[PDB]
Amino acid sequence: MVSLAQVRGALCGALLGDCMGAEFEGSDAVELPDVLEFVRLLEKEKKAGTLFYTDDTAMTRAVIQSLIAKPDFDEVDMAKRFAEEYKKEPTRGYGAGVVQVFKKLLSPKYSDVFQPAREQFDGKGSYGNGGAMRVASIALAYPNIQDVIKFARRSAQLTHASPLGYNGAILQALAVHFALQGELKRDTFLEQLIGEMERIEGLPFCSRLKKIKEFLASSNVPKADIVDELGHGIAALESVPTAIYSFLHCMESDPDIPDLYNNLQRTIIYSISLGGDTDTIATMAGAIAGAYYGMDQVTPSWKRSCEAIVETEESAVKLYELYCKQL
Numbered sequence: 001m002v003s004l005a006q007v008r009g010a011l012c013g014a015l016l017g018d019c020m021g022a023e024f025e026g027s028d029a030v031e032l033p034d035v036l037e038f039v040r041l042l043e044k045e046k047k048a049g050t051l052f053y054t055d056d057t058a059m060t061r062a063v064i065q066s067l068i069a070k071p072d073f074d075e076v077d078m079a080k081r082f083a084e085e086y087k088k089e090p091t092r093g094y095g096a097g098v099v100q101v102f103k104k105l106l107s108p109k110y111s112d113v114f115q116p117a118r119e120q121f122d123g124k125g126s127y128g129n130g131g132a133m134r135v136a137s138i139a140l141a142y143p144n145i146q147d148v149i150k151f152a153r154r155s156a157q158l159t160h161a162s163p164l165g166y167n168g169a170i171l172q173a174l175a176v177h178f179a180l181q182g183e184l185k186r187d188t189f190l191e192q193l194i195g196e197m198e199r200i201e202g203l204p205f206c207s208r209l210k211k212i213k214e215f216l217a218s219s220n221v222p223k224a225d226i227v228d229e230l231g232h233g234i235a236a237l238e239s240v241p242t243a244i245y246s247f248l249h250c251m252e253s254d255p256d257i258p259d260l261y262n263n264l265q266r267t268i269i270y271s272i273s274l275g276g277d278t279d280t281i282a283t284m285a286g287a288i289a290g291a292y293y294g295m296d297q298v299t300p301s302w303k304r305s306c307e308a309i310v311e312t313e314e315s316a317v318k319l320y321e322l323y324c325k326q327l
C-alpha cells in the first residue's frame with residue numbers, strides 16, 4: 001500500500017524539479033558547478049517562495065483538480081481546465097505548438113476535445129514532452145496499472161496525438177507507478193518498464209530503456225554520452241528516458257555530487273546538470289524519486305523555496321485519499 005509520504009514526495013519532487021530546473025531551461029551552457037552553486041544560494045535564501053513554477057506545474061495542478069473533481073476520469077473536464085489555466089496564466093512557458101490546442105479548445109468550434117491535438121503539425125500530432133511533464137498524478141490516483149496506462153494515454157492525447165508524445169506520457173506514468181511499489185531494485189524496475197513498453201509499442205522507447213540498462217552496467221558514464229544517446233530535448237523520446245536514467249543513476253553516489261545531498265536532491269541536481277529541457281527532465285525525475293523515496297527526502301530548506309508548496313502539499317493529501325478510495 002502506497003503511503004501519504006510517497007504521494008507527497010512525488011508531487012513535491014515534481015514541484016522542486018520544475019522550480020529549480022526553470023532557471024536553466026534551454027541552456028547548452030549549464031554545468032554541474034552552476035547547479036551546485038544555485039543550490040547553496042537557495043538554501044541560504046531568507047525569503048520563502050522565491051522560485052516560481054512553469055507550465056509543467058501549471059498543467060500538473062489542472063490534472064489534479066480534474067482528478068479530484070471527477071475521480072472516474074473526465075477528459076472533457078480536464079481539457080477545459082487545461083484551456084482555462086492557459087487563458088488565465090499564458091506566460092508560464094508553454095511550447096509554441098500546444099498554445100494552438102488551447103486556443104481551439106477555448107473557441108466554440110470543436111466538440112471533440114481530442115481533435116485540436118490531432119490537427120497539430122500537419123495532422124501528425126506533437127511528439128513533445130508536455131503530456132509526460134504533467135502525468136505523474138495519474139499514477140498517484142489510480143492503483144490499477146491498466147487504469148494508469150489508459151488514463152495516462154488519454155490525458156496526454158488532449159495535447160499530444162503523436163504516439164511518441166502519448167507513449168512518452170505512458171512511460172513516465174509507469175515509472176511513477178513502479179516507483180510507488182516499494183524497495184524496488186534497479187534491475188526489477190527496468191524489467192517492469194521494458195515489459196510494459198514492449199507490449200504497448202510492439203520500438204523507440206524500449207530501445208532507449210535498453211540503452212539505460214547498458215549505461216547503468218557501466219561506470220563513470222560522461223554527461224556527453226547520456227546527452228548524445230538518450231537526449232535532453234523537448235521531444236518526449238529525448239527526455240522521458242533521460243529522467244528515468246537520472247532517477248536510476250542517483251540511487252547510488254555520484255562522484256561529482258557531494259554525499260551530503262540525499263538521493264532525491266542528487267536526482268534533481270543531476271537532472272538539471274544534463275542541460276537542455278531542465279525544468280521538464282527534473283520535474284519528471286523528481287516525481288519518480290519523490291514517489292520512491294517519499295517526503296522524508298524533501299527537505300524544509302528546499303521545499304520552502306517553491307511557489308505553491310502549501311497548495312501542493314494539500315493537493316497530495318487529496319490525491320492520497322482518492323488512491324485509498326480506489327482500493
Ligand SMILES: O=c1[nH]cnc2c1ncn2[C@@H]1O[C@H](COP(=O)(O)OP(=O)(O)OC[C@H]2O[C@H](O)[C@H](O)[C@@H]2O)[C@@H](O)[C@H]1O
Pocket residue numbers: 054055056093094095096097098099121124125126127128129130131133159162234235277279280
Ligand atoms: O510533430 C512535430 N513536428 C515538429 N516539431 C514538433 C513536433 N512535435 C513537437 N515538436 C516540437 O516540440 C515543441 C514542443 O511541443 P508542443 O508545442 O506540443 O508543446 P509541449 O507542451 O510538448 O512542450 C513542452 C515543453 O514546453 C516547455 O519548454 C516545457 O517546460 C516543456 O519543455 C514544438 O513547439 C516543436 O518545436
Ligand SMILES: [Mg+2]
Pocket residue numbers: 054055056092093094279280
Ligand atoms: Mg516549463
Ligand SMILES: [Mg+2]
Pocket residue numbers: 025277278279280281
Ligand atoms: Mg521544459
